[PDB]
Design a protein around this ligand. Structure first.
Ligand SMILES: [Zn+2]
Ligand SMILES: [Zn+2]
Ligand SMILES: [Zn+2]
Ligand SMILES: [Zn+2]
Length: 208
């Protein structure tokens, strides 16, 4: 069902609604599964020390079906979109904490329960079908990680036991950066799906 140009509140729901309905995928439309969302790997540099690298593998992320689109601005002369969200993400994956300057690494599992608030911005333009029908075309966006709330992080006990036995923010800052990096991959994926719906439906569809 269409919105009426201008009504920002109408949109957020259409999107949330799109995200939930399609969130497990639809290959033929290039709509990616985003709940659960799988990230093959993601690397993260310690902000307080570039010799320290967190290597995530197999991140499995749930929660994105349900995120709220709590703010939605479409500017028509500049043709750009600002939008804010919150997701409660449950994250699980393999982790390798790599201390490059010490020639060692520690391995195990990682789990993070966090509520993330962010901002996606992109511009867009109008463009035609082969039949001359107009679609929106959404352009490469940027993602700003506005906050991560107060995360719960757990390390598998083999790892946390290895860490303790070795040392027997940077913290804050490192924990923050990992969540933001992960949130960022999450939203590259969200917007991919927004971008994809825009290919699947005439611009006319999205407003009255
Ligand atoms: Zn794609
Ligand atoms: Zn909502
Ligand atoms: Zn939770
Ligand atoms: Zn078309």
């Amino acid at each position: 069902k269409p919105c009426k140009l201008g009504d920002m509140q109408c949109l957020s729901s259409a999107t949330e609604q799109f995200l939930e309905k399609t969130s497990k995928g639809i290959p033929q439309y290039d709509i990616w599964p985003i709940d659960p969302l799988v990230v093959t790997s993601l690397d993260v540099i310690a902000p307080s020390d570039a010799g320290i690298v967190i290597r995530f593998k197999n991140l499995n992320i749930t929660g994105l079906k349900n995120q709220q689109i709590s703010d939605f601005q479409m500017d028509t002369k500049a043709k750009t979109v600002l939008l804010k969200t919150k997701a409660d993400l449950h994250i699980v994956g393999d982790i390798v904490i790599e201390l490059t300057e010490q020639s060692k690494s520690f391995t195990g599992l990682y789990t993070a329960d966090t509520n993330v608030i962010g901002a996606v911005r992109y511009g867009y333009n109008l463009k035609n079908d082969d039949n001359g029908v107009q679609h929106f075309e959404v352009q490469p966006e940027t993602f700003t990680c506005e906050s991560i709330g107060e995360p719960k992080i757990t390390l598998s006990s083999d790892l946390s036991s290895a860490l303790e036995k070795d040392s027997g923010e940077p913290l804050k800052t490192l924990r923050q950066a990992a969540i933001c990096k992960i949130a960022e991959a999450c939203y590259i994926s969200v917007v991919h799906n927004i971008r994809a719906s825009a290919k699947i439906l005439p611009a006319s569809s999205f407003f009255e």
